[PDB]
Amino acid sequence: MKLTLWTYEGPPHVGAMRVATAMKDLQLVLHGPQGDTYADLLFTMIERRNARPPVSFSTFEASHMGTDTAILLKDALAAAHARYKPQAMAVALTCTAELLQDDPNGISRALNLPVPVVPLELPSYSRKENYGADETFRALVRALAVPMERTPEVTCNLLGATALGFRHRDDVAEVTKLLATMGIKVNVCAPLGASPDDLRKLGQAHFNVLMYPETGESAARHLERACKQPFTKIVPIGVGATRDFLAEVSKITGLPVVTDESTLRQPWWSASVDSTYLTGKRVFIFGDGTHVIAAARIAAKEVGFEVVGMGCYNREMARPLRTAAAEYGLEALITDDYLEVEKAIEAAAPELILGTQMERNIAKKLGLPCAVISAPVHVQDFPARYAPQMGFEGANVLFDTWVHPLVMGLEEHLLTMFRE
Amino acid sequence: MKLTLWTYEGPPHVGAMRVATAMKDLQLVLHGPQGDTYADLLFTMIERRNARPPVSFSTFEASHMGTDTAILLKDALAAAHARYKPQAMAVALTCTAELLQDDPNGISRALNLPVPVVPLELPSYSRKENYGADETFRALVRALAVPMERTPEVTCNLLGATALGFRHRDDVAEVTKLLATMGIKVNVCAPLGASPDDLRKLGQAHFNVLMYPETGESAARHLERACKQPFTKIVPIGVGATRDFLAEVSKITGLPVVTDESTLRQPWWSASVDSTYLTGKRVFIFGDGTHVIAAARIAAKEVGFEVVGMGCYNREMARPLRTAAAEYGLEALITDDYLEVEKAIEAAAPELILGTQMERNIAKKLGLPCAVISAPVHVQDFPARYAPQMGFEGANVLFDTWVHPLVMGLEEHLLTMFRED
Amino acid sequence: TFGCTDSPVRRERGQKAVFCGLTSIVWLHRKMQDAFFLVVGSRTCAHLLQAAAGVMIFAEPRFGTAVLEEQDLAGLADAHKELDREVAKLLERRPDIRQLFLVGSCPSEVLKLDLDRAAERLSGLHAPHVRVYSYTGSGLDTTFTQGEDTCLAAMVPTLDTTEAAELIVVGALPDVVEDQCLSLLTQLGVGPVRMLPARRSDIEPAVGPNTRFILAQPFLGETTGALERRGAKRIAAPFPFGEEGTTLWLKAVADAYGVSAEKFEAVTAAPRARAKKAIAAHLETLTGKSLFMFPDSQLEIPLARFLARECGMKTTEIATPFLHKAIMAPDLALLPSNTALTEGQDLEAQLDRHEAINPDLTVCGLGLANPLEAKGHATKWAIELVFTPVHFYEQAGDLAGLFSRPLRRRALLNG
Amino acid sequence: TFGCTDSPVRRERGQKAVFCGLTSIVWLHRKMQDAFFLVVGSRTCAHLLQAAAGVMIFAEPRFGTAVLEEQDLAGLADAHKELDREVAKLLERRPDIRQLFLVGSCPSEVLKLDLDRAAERLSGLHAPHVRVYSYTGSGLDTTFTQGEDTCLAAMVPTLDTTEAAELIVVGALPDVVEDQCLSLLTQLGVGPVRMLPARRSDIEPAVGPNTRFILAQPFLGETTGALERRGAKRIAAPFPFGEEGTTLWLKAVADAYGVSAEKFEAVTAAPRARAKKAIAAHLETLTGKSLFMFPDSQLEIPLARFLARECGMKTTEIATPFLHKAIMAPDLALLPSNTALTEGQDLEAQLDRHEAINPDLTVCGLGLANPLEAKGHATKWAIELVFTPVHFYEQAGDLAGLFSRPLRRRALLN
Ligand code: SF4
Ligand code: SF4
């Protein structure tokens, strides 16, 4: 047992929900207790969604345990199917149901539905949310994708966008627009926006864009072996990262790299004279692996900060992060304990903190400028306005967003220093 | 003499510099003393521009006054023509130059240059920045536009966008998008992005979109006479005003309204349950007339605030604003005096204040949530990111921007109470 | 046309959209300044507490969860040893905690983790400075506010004994509301009155065969039983929502204590007028409007009672996660006899009834709110009713305001 | 190799990109607690102050501008009465003000309102609580820092008479810098020393025939002239920038007061080594780099001296708005012999020379800076140098740091 107040990630079954809600015409059935429906709040409140998550629970409680739990799962599965007629379903165990002896795969197969029901294995006591989504998506893809003839014109898939992703919506839109400038159309984007029938059409794409390693890497690896599809290793957050990405995409396809830079403003903003006081500002960077690595390169090589501390909460990105951090002369902080983050921040004494919502709060207490680069994140960071982190508009967005807190902090510090 | 700390607007000649700097291939020459080049810092630092403004000063000082001041103006017109070979030029008086006896018209008529040189009357002790801009553009359009053969396709002009304009850059882009969606291409956008040659070709457009009355109305009125082009009277800020705008453009052109709303998220955002606490929240709105009128309709009819005060510093907009405020059962505050604003705010005790950079500061002192909706504005509100106030992306932007400080205010208040009220 | 005493209540089972009792810790701990709440459960439980607490999570709250690890799943010798180390470590960090609650969850229950026995052990090891209790807040056992009930019940048998004739007001109320309650009871001449729970562990009520208690909250079934086990007698009353609810509640106390009609009518006259005035500013919008309430907190029956009688609303289906007949008798007698009563839910069946009724206003949780608003149904989110001051005279207009607002917003935003 | 005493300086007029003397108010009023600076000018003058002040405008600062209206453009009599109305209003609105400066602008001077006469008249009227002065900050007369010069010069006639032989350190400095100066001079055995301006109106220094003064800022020509008219005698010294300048500045004072070489070396040893170690950190990116300086403040020559001799920079064109030949002698004698010097400015021509030279680092105004960056020239905005602490030992590394930063940002970003 670890005493826990804050947790950066929920249980893997929430990640499964994160993949189901992302998709359409797919029902997820979770074996779990009355009460676990609280996770729907996340999708309806934070993402401001117009429908109930395609998720339901067997809903066992004290007066229906023992041999009744198996029946409830069967009821739940049959009821979900008869009501929504999805193209496919998935079944999984909540943490509480993981201690029961019920076999979802056995139960679901004996029910013998006219659509595939994909049983998921999600160890709720050793693994967390991001694995839940990654594994759910891999299992879905393994069950549904088949080798196919390549489309006549060059296309790719987008992999790893989910519900409750930090800026996934607008990243998808922005990455689409920059592949379209190179003459590459998107085949399927998945999980987000995909149906199980779309998943069946994955194989006709030429390669995959792996947008988020934490939620798409397994499906990408599978699609590489099964559908002979290469996947991009570089995540286009940052001007520099976007170029390398497009260079990678060029190597994959043989197509030349074309760009529309008429709207790229970050490099000139950063080169301009009003940015020269940012030079050497000490930045501490925390969050998930993908966003921390991306932010570090922007901080050091695009804005001119000194990266003074670097880490992430998700074990699955530990090695890419440790490899990244060493180029800055730093040892990566790998932890899911916000109190450890708080110790590393005090010791590093930064001038700016790039992090999650926990870090915004640590930064408030210490009186330090902070900006948010990664999930977990409250309702504020699901904006009505266009807010990508990726590509060129994302580079513009990131610039305004990191700099704003610094100007506010200096401005408030100057105001109090000339009153008396 | 009015005792002055804060000024919402600068002198008319900065308005002239706003028009010149928006444009290409125009030199603006100003009769003024050494030292008035400080205004160059506004275009270079704030708008983050990568060239010196196309503006030069005769640069007179104490040792060379008298009959030398005319010589100096002559030299600067000559030097600016010889170096930048502009398509056209403007000449005007600084406030100190207005006290002198030199006639900018007769000096430049005598110089007899191979391009038009447009004289500008700018009353620097009675009029301000916006007027400077509105007049300068009007004079340039009077000088250059002619009756013309209409284009085969339905086209229009965008009228009023300038340098140092609050979100002019992205407003132009968004308006262009919503017109293109109706199959209406833009002919010329002026002043912002245009050349004197571009200005000659204004008349061939079917109609005019008046984006900002403060800096475009006078030119629009001229083009209504000279080239028979009617102009849009609705500023597309807010979902409803955008629809009223597109409807208006329908009447003018005969084309049906076609919208793309696949990305319009503001209506669902405010209808959603998270927005329910927003109802009845008392808002005080201030800025230039256009943005105050637009903001108030959004506040009341789209987000569900109660508008508890309205005003503007922009006297040219006094009537439309007074008329609009009556609809909300408010008396419009017309003042250039930040101290009056501060009193009105205190007397209204709002929960949100919408305004200028000055209103940001008044709000902070009172610890009230605040968002910026109008110039004058500091560096940040000239963003690298896409940031329109207009059209459908404007509506999304406006929603995030107004609501964020309220949720910050509620969040701050909640956790000071949590430990330990 | 008032009285649902003999009304057939639907006893419904199936898919449920409700919070577990763990959720109650969030606003319970704020009241008991001296206590800490340690959930023994999974990351799921931790995630829930985080979600329900929102911003409070950043304010060092006096709760937390011992997340069960894989090693804790294979052997019960190790787990009771780990829990002890985890407790001692927690109590050393926070010396000022006087009451520790070990809160049972679904995972700790399935695991057969004996938290009753752990509470006794830890209580031995940490006396006299910290008393430690045990109760369940699991989804298996408990819905939302029933978590407060199990909590208070667990501490009733440990309370001092007394032969004094005193009043206990049961239910954690917001501090301003409690103060008003106390003032009104003092003005009435009702001798020493204590709350359960008290604001601090060293001023908890005593109980004996002459103790009287009245419930400020309807969800207090087990606590009621435990107080009766100790010898106390309940004063039956409708719940103190609105002018009438509050008057009837006070009246029942008054009558129990032999307070004269003269004294009652004069202590109560002005606050009664105040509250009536504040409700009337909400009638235009509320009168004739139809109400549907999903099950969440057990407040829905008395709240529906208030909405129909004092706000001229029309009831359709009103559902509660649990319907305790004796405790709800006074309110049930006041509800419009047309009211369809439900205890429990099969979520999909209830939404089908809801869609048919087409109610003007729908009380439901955040899981259903936006989904319902998207289908054109005006909604008021339930959870706000548990944590906003709503009881008694002074909050009667604000109580009504919570329901008029969503309907007023709807009207503002679309012509 | 190091003499510019006899270098022929190019004097130029024409188009200028410089600030007027009004700008000086922004950091002057911060020093003088009791003071209020009322400009008499147009909306342009108020707009400049607003831009120059930035966020300080929202800090209720002790300046403002009586902006001229139509009515005020004619004629004298009525305008003067109107000024009094505003001044009387201002004084009761802020009663803790003991010094009022009527600052002349270009508009006021063309209009020929006699602010000197208004000051006289208002002094009589608001005596003894408020003394009122007048000086010019106009673009016609004055460039940027010269506004401090005319301000202090306007105070000198009225300072108290004394026969004591005390030191006056002239020029507004950041309090942190002032304190250091005081401490070093005090531990050298030099006292008492006073500042002009002082922090409050009631502790302004006295002058008389036995007074000695030393300038901390190069732009103090009229002030020097005024103090000499009252009989005070100047101590000549290069300006206290970097280890060398500060030492030399301090040495001139210690020589004047008979302090021994033994004391000088002991008090000065540790701060000296400390200063030259802080500078060394910046020696990496600065050595060998060419320097070009547009005219702004009259700090350019001392600063170029510091950058060449202590930071290993090569000089090219070093321009200044005004060059006082006597005051600048010590620093001119230390500048490298190759330096092209320019007094005044003719912008287009000076931008042609700049382009031809292609210097590594350019000090210039914000109005030039970005446009020059866009053309691939590393720049350093000048205005920062007048408000940041930069004089004396403790700040020598920071000063070097002001010039190394833009160069290491250019390297870092490409
Ligand atoms: S329903 Fe059970 S498993 Fe789920 S959060 Fe509540 S106590 Fe934990
Ligand atoms: S240069 Fe003259 S007119 Fe311009 S701001 Fe300075 S004093 Fe005023």
User: Chain D interface, mutation test: which of A276, A416, A417, most D Cβ atoms within 10 Å?
Assistant: A276
Q: How many CB atoms lie within 10 A of CB C380?
A: 21
Substitution candidate for ligand 1 out of C40, C44, C103 with most atoms within 8 A of CB: C44
Local structure of residue A60 (DSSP, 8 states): B
SS3 A145: coil
Residue of B304, B415, B418 lying closest to C412 (CB–CB): B304
Provide the sign of the torsion angle of the four alpha carbons C28, C31, C32, C33, taken in this order.
positive
**B32 within ligand 2 shell (Cβ under 6 A):** no
B274 is catalytic: yes
**For domain A238-280+391-420, is the CATH number 3.40.50.720?**
no
Q: Give the whole-angstrom CA distance, residue C61 versus residue C50.
A: 11
DSSP state of C375: T
B56 interfacial to chain D (CB closer than 8 Å): yes
Whether C167 is in the pocket of ligand 1, judged by its Cβ within 6 Å, is no
Of D56, D369, D406, the CB nearest to A418: D56
Nearest to D61 by CA among D76, D49, D73: D49
**CB-based contact B34 D20, cutoff 8 Å:** yes
Spatial distance between the Cα atoms of B230 and B233, rounded to a whole number of angstroms: 9
- Backbone phi, psi, residue C18, to 5°: -140, 155
Q: Which of D30, D405, D412 sits opposite A418 (nearest CB)?
A: D30
Distance CA C170, CA C218 (A): 10
Residue D105 Cβ contacting ligand 2 at under 6 Å = yes
Q: Counting Cβ atoms within 10 Å, is residue C244 exposed (0-12), middle (13-18) or buried (19+)?
A: buried
Pairing of strands B88-93, B117-120: parallel
- Class of domain B281-374 (CATH, top level): alpha beta
Q: Give the ligand with the smallest distance to the CA of C107.
A: 1
CATH code for residues B11-147: 3.40.50.1980
Q: How far, in Å, CA of D23 to CA of D19, rounded?
A: 7
Q: What are phi and psi of A408, to 5 degrees?
A: -60, -45
Contact yes or no for D369 and A304 at CB 8 A: no
Instruction: For strands A306-312 and A333-334, give the pairing.
Output: parallel
List Cβ neighbours of C143 (8 Å cut-off, separation of 6 or more): A34, A35, C18, C19, C20, C21, C295, C321, C322
The domain segmentation of chain B, as residue ranges, is 11-147, 149-237, 238-280+391-421, 281-374
Residues 6+ apart with CB under 8 A from A97: A30, A31, A32, A33, A58, A60, A69
Asked if residue A75 lies in contact with residue A102, where contact means CB atoms within 8 angstroms, the answer is no
Q: Which residues of A touch B263 (CB under 8 A)?
A: 386
Describe the crossing of helices A168-180 and A391-417 by its angle, rounded to 10 degrees.
130
Which stretches within B99-155 are classed as H helix? 104-111, 129-144
| Paired residues of C340 in beta bridges | C317
DSSP string, C67-95: E--GGGGS-HHHHHHHHHHHHHHHHHH-T
Indicate left, alpha or beta for D392 from its phi (over 0: left) and psi (-120 to 50: alpha): left
d(CA D205, CA D214): 13
DSSP three-state, residue C389: coil
In angstroms, what is the resolution?
Answer: 2.5
The alpha carbons of chain D give a radius of gyration, in whole angstroms, of 22
- Measure the CA–CA gap between C146 and B100, rounded to whole angstroms: 85
The pair of structure tokens assigned to C350 is 């209830």
Q: Tell me how far apart the alpha carbons of residues A340 and A320 are, in angstroms, rounded to a whole number.
A: 21
Helix spans in A254-337 (H): 266-271, 289-298, 318-326
Q: Which of residues 48-67 of D touch B (CB under 8 A)?
A: 48, 50-52, 57-58, 61, 64-67
- Number of Cβ within 10 Å of residue A150's Cβ equals 16
Q: Does B281-374 match B11-147 at the fold level?
A: yes
Chains in contact with D, counting 3 or more C-beta pairs less than 8 Å apart as contact = A, B
C46 in contact with ligand 1, CB cutoff 6 A: no
Q: D residues 104-133 near B, CB within 8 Å?
A: 106-107, 109-111
Distance B35 CA to ligand 2 centre (A): 6
DSSP D2-68: ---TTPPPEEE-SS-----GGGGHHHHTTT-TTEEEEEEE-HHHHHHHHHHHGGGGGS--SEEEEE-
Closest CA to B249 of B219, B220, B207, B218: B207
Please state how this structure was obtained: X-ray
Structural domains in chain C, sorted by start = 1-19+282-415 (3.40.50.1980), 20-158 (3.40.50.1980), 159-281 (3.40.50.1980)
Tokens 């016609």 sit at which residue?
A: D140
Residues 6+ apart with CB under 8 A from B240: B297, B298, B301, B302
**Max Cα distance, chain B (Å):** 78
Taking the Cβ of residue B272 and every Cβ of chain C, the question of whether any pair is shorter than 8 Å is answered with: yes
Is residue A61 within 6 Å of ligand 1 at its C-beta?
A: no
Measured CA to CA, the distance from residue D300 to residue D304 in angstroms comes to 6
**Nearest alpha-carbon partner for A402 in A265, A268, A244, A285:** A285
The C-alpha atoms of residue D252 and residue A316 are separated, in whole angstroms, by 68
Distance CA A330, CA B306 (A): 53
A367-to-A351, A361, A416, B349, D192 alpha-carbon distances in Å: 10, 10, 14, 28, 42
Residue B191, preceding peptide bond in cis (omega within 30° of 0): yes
B361-370 contact pairs (CB < 8 A, 24+)? B361/D58, B362/B338, B368/B409, B369/B405, B369/B406, B369/B408, B369/B409, B370/B405
Token pair, residue C211, equals 């103790």
Please list, in sequence order, all residues whose beta carbon lies within 8 angstroms of the beta carbon of residue A182, skipping any fewer than 6 positions away: A246, A249, A250, A255, A256, A257, A258
Relative to beta strand C35-41, strand C99-104 is parallel
Q: CA–CA separation, B90 vs B110, rounded Å? A: 15
Taking the C-alpha atoms of residue C245 and residue C237, their distance in angstroms, rounded to an integer, is: 9
Breaks (C-N over 2.5 A) in chain D follow: none
Rounded Cα gap, residues A307 and A293, in angstroms: 11
Residues of chain D by 3-state class (helix, strand, coil), percent to 5? 50, 15, 35
Considering only the top CATH level, what class is A149-237? alpha beta
In chain C, what residues touch A337 (CB-CB under 8 Å)? none
Place of tokens 């970005």: D370
Contact A241, A175 (CB under 8 A): no
Pairing status of strand B2-4 against strand D63-67: antiparallel
Q: How far is CA B333 from CA B321, B355, B407, D272, in A?
A: 9, 13, 28, 61
Q: Which ligand is nearest to the CA of B37?
A: 2
Distance CA C133, CA C123 (A): 8
DSSP-assigned beta bridge partners for residue B210: B159
Instruction: Give the helix ranges, DSSP H, for D219-295.
Output: 221-229, 242-256, 261-280, 283-286
**3-state secondary structure at position D210:** coil
Q: Does domain B238-280+391-421 have CATH number 2.40.110.10?
A: no
Beta carbons of A290 and A235 less than 8 angstroms apart: yes
C207 three-class SS: strand
The secondary structure of D325-377 as a DSSP string is: TTTTHHHHTTS-TT-EEEEE--HHHHHHHHHHH--SEEEE-HHHHHHHHHTT-
Q: Encoding tokens for residue A239? A: 């001007």
Burial-class residue C284 by CB neighbours within 10 Å (0-12, 13-18, 19+): exposed
User: Rounded distance, CA C362 to CA C295, Å?
Assistant: 11
Is B310:B359 a contact under the CB 8 Å cutoff?
A: no
Could you tell me how many residues make up chain B?
421
Q: To probe the interface with B, which of A372, A385, A399, A404 has the most B CB atoms within 10 Å?
A: A385
Give the C-alpha separation, D214 to D204, whole Å: 16
| Cβ-Cβ contacts under 8 Å, B276 against chain C | 381, 405-406, 409
Q: What angle do CA D65, D68, D71 make, to 5 degrees?
A: 150
In our burial notation (b when 16+ CB lie closer than 10 A, e otherwise), range D178-197 reads bebbbebbeebebeebbbbb
Q: Would you say how long chain A is, in residues?
A: 420
Angle of helix B391-418 versus helix B168-180 axis, rounded to 10: 130
User: Which ligand has its closest atom nearest to the C-alpha of D107?
Assistant: 2
Give residue A398 CA to ligand 2 midpoint distance, Å.
39
Question: Which residues 6+ apart lie within 8 Å of D276 measured at CB?
Answer: D243, D310, D396
> If 0-12 CB within 10 Å is exposed, 13-18 middle and 19+ buried, where does residue B2 land?
middle
- D290: tokens are 């060419």
Q: Which residues, 6 or more positions from A219, have their beta carbon under 8 angstroms from its beta carbon?
A: A134, A137, A138, A140, A141, A159, A160, A190
Give the minimum alpha-carbon distance from C370 to chain A in angstroms, rounded to a whole number: 6
